[PDB]
Amino acid sequence: TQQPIVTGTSVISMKYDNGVIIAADNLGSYGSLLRFNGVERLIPVGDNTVVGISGDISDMQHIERLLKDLVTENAYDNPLADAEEALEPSYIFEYLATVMYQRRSKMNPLWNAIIVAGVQSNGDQFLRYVNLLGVTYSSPTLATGFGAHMANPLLRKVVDRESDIPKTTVQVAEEAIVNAMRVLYYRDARSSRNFSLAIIDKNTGLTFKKNLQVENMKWDFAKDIKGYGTQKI
Amino acid sequence: TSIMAVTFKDGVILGADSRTTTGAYIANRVTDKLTRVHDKIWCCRSGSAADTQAIADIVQYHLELYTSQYGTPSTETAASVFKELCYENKDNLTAGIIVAGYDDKNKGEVYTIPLGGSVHKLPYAIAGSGSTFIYGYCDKNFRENMSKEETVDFIKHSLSQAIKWDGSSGGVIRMVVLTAAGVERLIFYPDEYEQL
Amino acid sequence: TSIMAVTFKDGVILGADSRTTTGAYIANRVTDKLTRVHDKIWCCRSGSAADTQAIADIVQYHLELYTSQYGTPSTETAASVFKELCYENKDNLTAGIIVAGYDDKNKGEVYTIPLGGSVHKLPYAIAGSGSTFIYGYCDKNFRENMSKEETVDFIKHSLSQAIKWDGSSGGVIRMVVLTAAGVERLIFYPDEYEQL
Amino acid sequence: SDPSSINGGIVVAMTGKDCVAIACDLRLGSQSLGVSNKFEKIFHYGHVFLGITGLATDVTTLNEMFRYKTNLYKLKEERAIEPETFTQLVSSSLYERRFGPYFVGPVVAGINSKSGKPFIAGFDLIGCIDEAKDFIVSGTASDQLFGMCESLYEPNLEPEDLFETISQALLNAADRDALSGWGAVVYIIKKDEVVKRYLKMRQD
Amino acid sequence: TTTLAFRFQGGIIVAVDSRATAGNWVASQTVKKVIEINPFLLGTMAGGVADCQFWETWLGSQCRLHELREKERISVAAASKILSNLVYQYKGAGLSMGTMICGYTRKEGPTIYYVDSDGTRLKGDIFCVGSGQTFAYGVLDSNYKWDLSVEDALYLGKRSILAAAHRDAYSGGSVNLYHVTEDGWIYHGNHDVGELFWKVKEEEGSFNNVIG
């Protein structure tokens, strides 16, 4: 049993017709203090998987090292490490999911919420969630923390069920993700303007975008708002 | 919350962010924390929003009734009314209020009233959760008898840093300028102050 | 405690106050919080004095044994050993350590390791109770590739403010300069830095 | 400890075609100990019926209170109180004890004597009105009653069909609750005749 | 829960209710509270349902191993003590168990042992365990004799559970009857309390308080 110290907020993601998108801001909070502004919370594993991690950053860095080690280990005595016996999202997830549940069962959890986004060998989209309790679930849209409450509603308007996935394009999906990231910046007190976004497409492969910013923000209406009820000036 | 009031050559300026949070959720991102208890006596509110609104309303009532009988109250008088409420009801209040006002006799004055209900008259005052991060900056950069443009820059830069580090602070930077000329409201948006 | 490490053109400089407190009593007013784990790898300690001393001693042992086998360790390696201890024993430790070191290949490097045991490589780092008050100042005044004299002034001014506001911080400002030239210790007394 | 589940018991009310039905078990207990199998929870003031679950001392007290109030109402108004009005009186009376409430789950049932419209309503212990069209449930087996009513109920039932539905809703819900049962009563209410029926059920 | 067991001329009568509750919620009305440890031994269930089930099935395995090694029926004393020594090892851990280990051997005759999760192991003629034990005791104590017939003893045990099923909110469902002889136990059926109550009320004239 511990308490999280340096924390990362919402990880949001969704499926689209050819793959998955995942996104997360670059902030490492220290309680209310916005301590670290250059934290990458999307960690790619090979060229077919991106693990997005929220919650305790020290535990994230540990998990990051486990995944790095997993790649090394998979390459050992494996002539097809960059082909048929490459790591799959489903392997990476199941490994993490095992670890999370074991750690909670020893009453010493990795204080995280994790979303494993990727594309399988057969071209299928992989999107599944796991957290400090070892709880796992899958959905056309997935989000952690505040993202669950604010991003999912918006992302579910695009892909409301499984049959919407083939109708959704990468441009529509990315637009929804980017809009969701803006909404979270308006409303999540532990979020930042700067974020990273990853697209894992079955055709174009992994596209990792760094140093993105929330833009087209609406603030002008603030000038008209005065007082808290009766004040006019 | 990040709030501050700064005296300068022509009078005084109050500054504030616009973020109100319920835990980590931003309940209001365009809050007006600069509130008016009299024509040229304003205050900055920090702490319980219910408490500080209730207090400010009572003060405004007291100063309105004062004005009807005895004419325009001094800034010191307004601070005293705030203090009386905050001190006597210290057990049931969570309020941190900066009182700023402009007389023609006394010019710009700033009074800060922290949790306990004590009063402190200062050249400038900072308060709210985000103030902790700018004690160093504000102490280094404040000068007395600054111009209006210099004071606006001082407040804008200070609250920019407070907002940058404090998650409880954010949104727009509101300002209210109190001088002989009158009352001027200013607003500064993220795209302006973030690049400072 | 007020500690900081700043990289600059010729390498890196570590800075610290000298106050150790047991509650409100100053148990030691001339503490040396700048500690040596290797020839040109030093650290700044904050948190439990027992914990940070125990950790630093273990790290120094590990780097001495490393050196005997594999030659001079990198600053990154030192930070990794600190992290391994702080992370794995996070439940039983209260340690906030800034690691700073000089290679000839990598030049000046600064790593900060907060309570959780995470590692963060930065151009400069601040830590300790007094750091809260200078986030604004340090962010506004830091530049990359400063000269030795500029970096000494930056640290001296920063810790001056940290000391000014933080009761847990005070005494002398110790500094340790890490460059190709060697290791230089600096000290600055209250009469010097208070008037800044 | 929990006042609403010391004595136990349940009430259920249902609307039908030109009729309402209200029913209750007969159990009064001290937690596990069964004390009385004749503790009726349905009262009536004129043609308005009130069922009350929860802490039995309050059930009794409120009955005596509403008898008191409806009797004065009648003397002053020169007419019997209506279900819609009585519902508001129950709500007012409960909320006046906002910070020291009666630990009860009242249920109003009746037929407006003027419009002929069937009416039911429920309340939490503090006065919030639940004015449902279909049915109202209350008591220690409210979950069970919700499940029974939701599946068994269908609108515009005739009086003697409604009787079967509400009876089977109560009985099977009570048989899944330790603190409910020990007999049951069902009131079938029409605009100018009411029929009271005691049900045969398992006595454990 | 209400379980009882009493020694008499014709052996042992075991009678149990069938109800299982989670708070006020009646989880099951068809719970088997008599374990058939083997064809000669019976165990009753009160307290933790799992704890009783698991460890009394386990007891059956230990009793089976005993008679395989010793070529002789295990004594009621030995069988009960295997269970009591086991639960005593778990004392403090939070096991919840109240049981009668009932049997009829040559050397002992009919024997009943009350075994408890606190480690209590008592031999006796009449035992009653569960939330409704007090109600069953009343009927038992006022009607018990050693020279009861197997027919009358079976009824007494059935009636004593009915008494408890009626009054105790956490007892009911149905009554399971067993009659333990030296040649093994004999099951005497499942009796729904709902139907049994009205039957007994009429034939016996009892429960005049209740309207039927």
Add this chain to the structure above:
Amino acid sequence: QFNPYGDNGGTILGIAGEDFAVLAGDTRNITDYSINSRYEPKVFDCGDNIVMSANGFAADGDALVKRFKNSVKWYHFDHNDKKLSINSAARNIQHLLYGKRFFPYYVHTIIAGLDEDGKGAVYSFDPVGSYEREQCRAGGAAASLIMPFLDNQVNFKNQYEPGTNGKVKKPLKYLSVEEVIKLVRDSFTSATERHIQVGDGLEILIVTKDGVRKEFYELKRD
């Protein structure tokens, strides 16, 4: 303080027919007032004509089902590909659950299939392994809403034959798979109306001597 348990909501329902069994469950997964997934399969085919669902805390539910499926696999290895009978599976699950008696799988487990005589079988477990063969069992969030309805509509409780007035009970006639599925769907439709954690979708696994068959139905998504 770290709480190792959580509530993922959901509701399950097992009904044993005369020569078939059904195990049904909603496909909604939740935490608190949020929906995690509108389609997260909860009822699983574990092989050997056995279906299983561990409702409650999903992490413990998935862990148990995973371990049981494993147990079935190893039963084949160790005992010459012998079929695991439903009663043997039940006893095996008791030991899995009681194995963690002092740190329980926070789930209400139900399995369904056919007994060795080819009749329908449902078994029901508490979190610590106590179990019983039953004809009817609802589990999870809306169990308290569904069981009374099943007592009435499956076992004909409190129902008597008209004209006799309480003297003759309604006879316990056997239900067909089409009849059971209607009761299952109405149970889940009713549970969806009155329970916030129930909804989205209903997945029913039907076990007969021919094998396991699935049926899916939409539920309200509010």
Add this chain to the structure above:
Amino acid sequence: MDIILGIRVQDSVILASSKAVTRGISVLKDSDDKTRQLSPHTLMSFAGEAGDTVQFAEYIQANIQLYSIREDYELSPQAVSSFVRQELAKSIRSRRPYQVNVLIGGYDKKKNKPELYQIDYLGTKVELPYGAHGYSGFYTFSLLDHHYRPDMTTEEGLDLLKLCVQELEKRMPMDFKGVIVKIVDKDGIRQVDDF
């Protein structure tokens, strides 16, 4: 205090009440009468927290005796029981509630019927053929359920009461030092001096 029983038969109400008074580790008295005559044909037994029990009983007694004098009329057992219930229902939401459970055994001279009322400290009233407070009911209600008939004679009621007391003396851990039995009928209240 501990055990108070009540049984309404054909033509009378019988109240049995323990004689023990224990405070801590000592039985201070073994002849305590836990009852008060409210009116010539109304008897109230009581059990609960020390001090409160007698204070409440005597307070009720005074109020009924006051009513009796004012109107020159005996209140019906039903009326007395309703008055008592209201006092307890008022008490439960007081600053310091009366922690008292009572049985009211009375003979209604108007209806010519015995009447037994069981009221607990919350103000929970129930009219019963037989009643008890505390753990007494747990042992005795099974016997009373079995043997009780509404047409029983007073002598049969006493025999059934003896069987209840015997069961209590067998299975209860506390020694309640026997019971004082009192009969309430048309002729008034009398005590059975040998029990």
Add this chain to the structure above:
Amino acid sequence: MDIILGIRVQDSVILASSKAVTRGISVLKDSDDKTRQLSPHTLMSFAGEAGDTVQFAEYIQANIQLYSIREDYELSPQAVSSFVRQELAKSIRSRRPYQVNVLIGGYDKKKNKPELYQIDYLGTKVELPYGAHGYSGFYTFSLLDHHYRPDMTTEEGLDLLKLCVQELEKRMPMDFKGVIVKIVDKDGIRQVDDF
């Protein structure tokens, strides 16, 4: 369990021990023998937490019986009591201590003397002319202080014991269902079947 008394007279030790076993609300048994014969001339009575009492007593019994067989010799009461004390003194600092209080009544065949030892669950041993555990002493010691003589006969010891039991039955709140009395003398151990 509840009351265990012991009295050492001229030529014997008498142990009186209650018969009740009350688990909670009900008295499950009224004929329980709270004693074990450790050796032919050594008897141990016991009282404490359920399960622990009998488990401890039988464990001690086994160990003494093992010693008796190994050496073909009966340990002196003093030796047995010292063995028992050490076990309890070891127990008190264990993960889960034995919550058991004992009286060891033995006749030393070497010295031709009765001996009574009182040992509590902490391992506090004292040799006494008369002893008790729990609340039993709180009454009986005043009577024993007054009447006891070291030269009393076994019959006088029993009469004094009756007076102790009568006082307990009068002033104790709990019904302990009488006592089983056992005498330990030169001829061994025997039970007084009428008391």
Add this chain to the structure above:
Amino acid sequence: TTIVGVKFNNGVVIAADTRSTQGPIVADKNCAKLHRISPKIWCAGAGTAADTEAVTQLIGSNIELHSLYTSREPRVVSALQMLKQHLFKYQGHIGAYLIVAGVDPTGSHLFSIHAHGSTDVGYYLSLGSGSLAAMAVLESHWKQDLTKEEAIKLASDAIQAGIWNDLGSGSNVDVCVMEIGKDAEYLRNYLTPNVREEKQKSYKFPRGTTAVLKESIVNICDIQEE
């Protein structure tokens, strides 16, 4: 509960879902959360349902008496000031969280009120368990100078976000439109996207299925003449 308020060109609109809950159980599937303080001042409530209803009636009653006393139509700021001062006095124990909206001679207004007595001004607001789902929609689509039709659409879409994604919210969308120089139009069950499907079976029992012990006529009539 999901409640929203949205300012527009010539007025304000409020909306709410229609699910009231007791724990995880749905007590009422068509609850009316849009309360009338005065003819053109309406509010929606979340939190303790009795408190929201009670406090709106009380203030609404006093607002009416005030309106009669001053011979003027009530103002939203008066309702706001009266609500906040009442709630503040009870220090949050009255669990009423309200979105107050209306039109008066001053203009159109939109406020929120928390239980402790703090109030906020805005162009778009949301409250209750589904406020985060609703606000996400409001933040995505709101703009200055909305028309009446756009604001109703935005408002009901925000309520829907709550209905689908928040378990505490569900059933139907109520709306009330308060436009300047017009009567407020209360649109009870404006949307109905959650009608229960037809059950598979009819559970109407055969008459005489339930066992009865006694029957009797209940005398509801008064004491009769003659």
